């Protein structure tokens, strides 16, 4: 008697979509492109407003502490909400889950992007998103602001550690995050069509279109200073591969290209991504990225939401002032100056994700997935993948000496030192806990020092001093020490030093340890750093990169478990003057070459 055709679960997505769209008001279209922060919703809100999507922005939680049971309450109070209007449409929520779902207390943090480039294994990407995806259901979330497929051209870029390298091809063979996330595609898909394969996947994002990770010093405010490829070779590849293997949503950049704001750019986000890859999904906004389309931001709005429409964006980040983007929106479509072509287009974008992803057979969270998050299935993964990221740059003073690494575990007395050695903040990074990370004990996991006291024989005596000074060293009757020193957790505009030197103490911490003993440097960083001093100093060194929650990953090496088989992602610069410098440069005078790696052999 009271059927209605978008909400039979048999009927073809575009069907469906069709049927919903044609009963919508401007009011309940205008909703479905409104994503709101979770700090400015109420039940009240999302109803009266229709709206589309929620996020969690990085530290945006419910609670310090909060269980997954506590996040899918928070997540399906919100769809109730959204399920009580006129027409039920689900909302879908967002969240940077970048590596792992790591605003979440006690998630797998796994390694940042530029340790997974270092491993150059893209089943273990996939692998990892398929982790992250059951991390992110567990707290009930359907959707993850992932993988960030920027090719970093510059190291000093604030977010050069979420780019798996300046190389485009390692960029592209990692795209297999997105079917980790989100489901392997059908044999016979089509390029460009969004796919999630159910309730135990998660729409993705890949971001952020384009040419986020180009040049100028080192990209970060900026901008593209390169022009047509350029593009289409370095810093496009990637998101065709992703139009492959169905990615849900693309996500626009800050940046411009061309001098043309990337959320005003019509031609490449309706002209090359929608009309020329054949992209399906939706495309959404930066946070508060239209607003930034005008200087200063936000100084004139009706143009920023007139502009990033017609440009061709579907759902816009707003976060906060989601009354004025609606007020705005509905005044231009009224006066005529955004068709409703447009925004029907935009809607259908929206739809077509949330039927395809099964969003309207199940709106609520799975409490029986709660326990995913930070399995130890999940954790072991992780220790896998930071392991394989590490990438030994040195094993030894000179040709003649035994390599120090892999070190023995059964010896009388050994030091573990460093600011990094037990900070699982530090070892994190940024992205973590949130949005710029923190020191200390944030949440779950194995730090460098908790690591080694797992590793070693009963019998090893393990001593651990922060800051240790030379006469501590050498009077302490050590047979080696690990030294762990490095970055402290970063983002695009803060923390971000662009001397690329690791902060003090760091490098007197390495000096006064090596001096007295024969030491391995582990160096906790998002990108290659002054390193000279660290290598004269040290008897073998690491760089680790951001590992994440699971330390053993890096004692697993140490103590030679494993082999090191990790290869540089990235160019070492011998000095910051050289920058910018990618494998290709004209006068290419690395410290060490983009694919250095030393390896040893399982002991
Ligand atoms: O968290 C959602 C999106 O956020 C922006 S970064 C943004 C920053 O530009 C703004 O000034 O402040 C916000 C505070 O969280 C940041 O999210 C990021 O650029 C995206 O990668 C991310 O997915």
């Given at each position: 008697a009271d059927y209605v055709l978008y909400k039979?679960?048999?009927?073809p997505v575009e069907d469906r979509v069709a049927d919903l769209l044609g009963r919508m008001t401007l009011a309940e279209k205008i909703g479905q492109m409104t994503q709101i922060e979770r700090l400015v919703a109420t039940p009240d809100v999302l109803r009266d407003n229709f709206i589309g999507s929620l996020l969690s922005g990085?530290?945006?939680?419910?609670?310090?502490?909060?269980?997954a049971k506590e996040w899918q309450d928070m997540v399906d109070g919100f769809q109730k909400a959204c399920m009580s209007?006129?027409?039920?449409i689900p909302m879908i929520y967002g969240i940077?889950?970048?590596?792992?779902?790591?605003?979440?207390?006690?998630a797998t943090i796994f390694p940042h992007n530029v340790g997974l480039g270092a491993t150059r294994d893209p089943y273990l990407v996939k692998r990892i998103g398929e982790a992250t995806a059951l991390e992110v259901r567990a707290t009930?979330?359907?959707?993850?602001?992932?993988?960030?497929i920027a090719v970093c051209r510059?190291?000093?870029?604030?977010?050069?550690?979420?780019?798996?390298?300046?190389?485009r091809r390692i960029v592209q063979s990692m795209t297999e995050l997105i079917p980790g996330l989100q489901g392997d595609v059908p044999k016979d898909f089509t390029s460009g069509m969004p796919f999630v394969a159910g309730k135990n996947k998660v729409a993705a994002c890949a971001k952020?279109?384009?040419?986020?990770?180009?040049?100028?010093?080192?990209?970060?405010?900026?901008?593209?200073?390169?022009n047509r490829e350029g593009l289409m070779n370095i810093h496009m590849p990637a998101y065709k591969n992703a139009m492959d293997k169905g990615v849900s949503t693309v996500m626009i950049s800050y940046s411009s290209w061309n001098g043309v704001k990337m959320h005003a750019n019509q031609d490449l986000?309706?002209?090359?991504?929608?009309?020329?890859?054949?992209?399906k999904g939706f495309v959404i906004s930066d946070w508060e990225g239209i607003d930034r389309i005008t200087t200063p931001a936000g100084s004139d709005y009706s143009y920023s939401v007139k502009a990033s429409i017609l440009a061709g964006?579907?759902?816009?980040?707003?976060?906060?002032?989601y009354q004025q983007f609606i007020s705005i929106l509905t005044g231009h479509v009224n006066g005529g100056v955004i068709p409703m072509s447009r925004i029907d287009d935009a809607v259908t974008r929206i739809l077509r994700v949330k039927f395809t992803m099964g969003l309207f057979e199940n709106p609520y969270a799975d409490?029986?997935?709660?326990?995913?998050?930070?399995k130890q299935e999940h954790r072991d993964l992780a220790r896998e993948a930071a392991r394989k990221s590490?990438?030994?740059?040195?094993?030894?003073?000179?040709?003649?000496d035994a390599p120090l690494?892999?070190?023995?575990?059964?010896?009388p007395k050994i030091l573990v030192a460093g600011?990094?050695?037990?900070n699982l903040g530090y070892q994190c990074?940024?992205?973590?806990?949130?949005?710029?990370g923190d020191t200390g004990?944030?949440?779950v996991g194995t730090t460098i020092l908790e690591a080694v006291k797992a590793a070693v024989d009963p019998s090893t005596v393990v001593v651990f001093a922060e800051n240790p000074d030379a006469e501590f060293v050498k009077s302490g009757g050590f047979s080696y020490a690990i030294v762990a020193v490095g970055e402290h957790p970063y983002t695009e505009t803060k923390?971000?030093?662009?001397?690329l030197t690791i902060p003090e103490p760091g490098l007197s911490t390495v000096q006064a340890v090596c001096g007295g003993v024969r030491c391995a440097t582990v160096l906790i960083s998002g990108r290659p750093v002054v390193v000279q001093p660290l290598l004269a100093a040290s008897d073998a060194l690491v760089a680790?990169?951001?590992?994440?929650?699971?330390?053993q990953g890096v004692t697993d090496a140490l103590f030679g478990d494993f082999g090191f088989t990790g290869r540089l992602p990235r160019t070492w610069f011998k000095?910051?003057?050289?920058?910018?410098?990618?494998?290709?440069?004209?006068?290419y005078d690395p410290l060490f070459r983009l694919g250095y790696g030393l390896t040893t052999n399982a002991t």
């Open positions: 039979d679960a048999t009927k990085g530290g945006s939680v419910p609670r310090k502490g909060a269980t209007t006129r027409l039920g940077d889950a970048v590596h792992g779902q790591n605003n979440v207390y006690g009930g979330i359907q959707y993850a602001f992932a993988p960030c510059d190291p000093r870029w604030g977010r050069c550690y979420e780019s798996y390298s300046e190389d952020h279109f384009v040419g986020d990770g180009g040049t100028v010093d080192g990209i970060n405010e900026n901008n593209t200073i390169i986000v309706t002209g090359y991504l929608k009309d020329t890859l054949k992209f964006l579907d759902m816009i980040m707003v976060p906060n002032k409490p029986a997935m709660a326990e995913q998050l930070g590490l990438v030994l740059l040195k094993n030894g003073k000179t040709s003649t690494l892999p070190l023995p575990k059964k010896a600011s990094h050695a037990d990074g940024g992205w973590t806990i949130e949005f710029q004990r944030t949440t923390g971000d030093n662009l001397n680790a990169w951001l590992p994440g929650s699971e330390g000095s910051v003057d050289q920058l910018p410098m990618n494998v290709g440069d004209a006068h």
